[PDB]
Amino acid sequence: KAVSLVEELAQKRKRGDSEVALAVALVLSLANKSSRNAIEAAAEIAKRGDSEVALAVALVLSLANKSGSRNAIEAAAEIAKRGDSEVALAVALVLSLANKSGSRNAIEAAAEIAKRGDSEVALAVALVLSLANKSGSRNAIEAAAEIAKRGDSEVALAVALVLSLANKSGSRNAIEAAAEIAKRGDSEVALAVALVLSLANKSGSRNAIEAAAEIAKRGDSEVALKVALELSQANKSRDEIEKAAENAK
Amino acid sequence: DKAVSLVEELAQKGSEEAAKEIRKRGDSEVALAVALVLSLANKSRNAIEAAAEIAKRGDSEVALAVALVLSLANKSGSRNAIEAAAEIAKRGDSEVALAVALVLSLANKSGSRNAIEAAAEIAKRGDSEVALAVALVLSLANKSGSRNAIEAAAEIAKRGDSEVALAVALVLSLANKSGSRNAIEAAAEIAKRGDSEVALAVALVLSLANKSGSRNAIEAAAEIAKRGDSEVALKVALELSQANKNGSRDEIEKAAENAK
């Protein structure tokens, strides 16, 4: 029967694998209601006969119609032509997260990442998006959009570190400053701060963590590294962690 | 019509009604999606039980993500990964299913069984942030083409720490853009070590070396990475950062030699 649904949707088998059959029906059912290139791409997948790939494409395609951005529909077509499940999935995440983002910058950025089709960028962007969506600050979501727009794997990975590290500190000041760093959008500041926060949390001193949030807010790359040095060596005297924290204050 | 038929036929087969609801809505994407979800459940008990929750939801995005994770749980052929996928299907969060799909898919394409073992663990923990961060380290190890990095990625994935994975994926990524085979070589050494403070401190140096655009700086940075001394990376990072700000092409090469 599945071949019938794929055959009807195709026309409008010899292998006989249900999943592939249904999977492709999706790829064609989604293409036929979309972009001439989209329909053409969906066909190429059907000829491929890959269970995993057909779904990822349909998924990126399903997410392409939800945003509406034809650039997303056209970008999904090229990913369908590339036929790499890694690229499709990572773009699915960025697209899915941009939709749940509630930001048109994020949606516009996500479509841009789809065109470029860089797997590494989309995943790192999807991280920064996943964190901004959980942070609950309108400014952070736009910071992520700005980051995703730049299409830089390093800033996304450096900012995601800072956001992730702040969320584990439970310190509103640290989170407040973390969103500030994403706005600034500087890879060198985020990493220098990512160290400080990482080293404060590991030392497990609220005064160290809050001192770090102070450093982050100030956003002075050299100062974070100076404290990172002072904080690192103490980690290697609970009496002393407070000293370097106060000094950083 | 066939969509509701295929879903209904598979729905009759020990299913827990929902098919009538989906049929009443008459959405193909949801219908084909759920059909795939149930089809994958039948051949695979909690999965069959879990798939019904998806069917009643009538959500196109979740059904595919779940079906995808299910499809990959079959190709891995690891029972633990099947059960893990069922718990994710019970949640019905397309984000977790997607991020886990990647880790599972990337672990399958890696060829390391430690990795596939790890990928299954990630599905059980169902941590959206860890699955993505690991997927990075995995995606980067599969592209590096050094069997040790893949096993390094498996170890990282095994520990289930988003910080170490994000710090390591940073150095690996930073090394791949350096074009320096020794930097890439040292980057694989860092991931094996598995130290977050070391990788970050090194990620800094590399970030600064690449930015300054001095091959001496990069090769010096790679030397630092090989040593793996966190305190020494930050010292050079400070010396390197301040040259990147002034732009003294004569100075950058000076602090690069100092790092040796």
Author numbering:
A (entry chain B): 8 to 19, 33 to 54, 56 to 257, 260 to 272
B (entry chain A): 7 to 19, 21 to 23, 27 to 54, 57 to 272
Task: Cite, word for word, the article reporting this structure.
Here we describe a systematic approach to generating modular and rigid repeat protein oligomers with coincident C2 to C8 and superhelical symmetry axes that can be readily extended by repeat propagation. Repeat proteins are composed of an asymmetric structural motif that is concatenated several times in tandem within a single protein chain. From these building blocks, we demonstrate that a wide range of unbounded fibres can be systematically designed by introducing hydrophilic surface patches that force staggering of the monomers; the geometry of such fibres can be precisely tuned by varying the number of repeat units in the monomer and the placement of the hydrophilic patches. All multiplexes follow the naming convention CsHRN_Rr where s is the cyclic symmetry, HR stands for helical repeat, R is the number of repeats in a single chain and N is an index to differentiate between multiplexes of the same symmetry.
We also expressed a C2 dimer directly as an eight-repeat duplex (C2HR4_8r), and the structure by X-ray crystallography to be close to the design model (r.m.s.d. compared with design model = 3.78 Å). The twist of the crystal structure is approximately 22.5° per repeat or 16 repeats per turn, and hence by propagating this structure from 9 to 17 repeats, the angle between the N and C terminal repeats can be modulated from 180° to 360°.
